[PDB]
Amino acid sequence: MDAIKKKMQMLKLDKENALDRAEQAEADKKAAEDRSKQLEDELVSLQKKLKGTED
Amino acid sequence: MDAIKKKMQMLKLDKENALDRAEQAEADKKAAEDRSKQLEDELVSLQKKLKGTED
Amino acid sequence: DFDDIHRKRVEKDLNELQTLIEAHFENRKKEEEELISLKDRIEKRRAERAEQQRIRNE
């Protein structure tokens, strides 16, 4: 009819916005966790270098 | 009718799924970010003690 | 954000659309009432034509 189509369009705009936000948040999590794990690896290498210096 | 109900329910389900997924991702992002901050703070002190050891 | 204004926009879109939906609902409903009254006076016409035709035939 008439109002039904508009209501469907609203329900679809919510769909697109929610899905896009979810995808963006997932990409953010991937990037942040990669950052953290690379920092942890750098910390490990520093520990090993400290061990060599102690030797 | 029949089509309106199923389509509307499926679209609302899609919106809710995307929202909850985004919230989970952002929570993990915040936790990883704070842990990364902890890693930075500990790494600086590790570098300082390494520098003293080298001196 | 842009998502906020987009949400408000699709929101007012849904509002105006459901408004016009109920509106044409009411309009076509009035038209159906008029058509029902038309059918009723039509059956009145059928009955009156039947009785006068039957009188003529008698």
A4: which chain C residues are within 8 Å (Cβ-Cβ)? 17, 21
Angle at A54 between CA A52 and CA A55, to 5 degrees: 65
**Rounded distance, CA C19 to CA C13, Å?**
10
Q: Name every residue whose Cβ is closer than 8 Å to that of residue A29 and which is 6 or more positions away in sequence.
A: B25, B26, B28, B29, B32
**C-alpha atoms less than 13 angstroms from C-alpha of C52 in its C-beta half-sphere:** 6
Comparing C-alpha atoms, which of B13, C42, B34 is closest to residue A19? B13
Comparing C-alpha atoms, which of C24, B16, B13 is closest to residue A6? C24
Encoded amino acid at B46, one letter: L
How many of the other CB atoms lie within 10 Å of CB of C34? 10
**Rounded distance, CA A37 to CA A43, Å?**
10
Q: Name every residue whose Cβ is closer than 8 Å to that of residue A44 and which is 6 or more positions away in sequence.
A: none
Q: After which residues is chain A broken (C to N over 2.5 A)?
A: none
* Residue entry with tokens 């991702």: B25
Q: Do chains C and A touch (3 or more CB pairs under 8 A)?
A: yes
Q: Does B6 contact A at CB distance below 8 Å? A: no
B5: which chain A residues are within 8 Å (Cβ-Cβ)? none
Experimental approach: cryo-EM
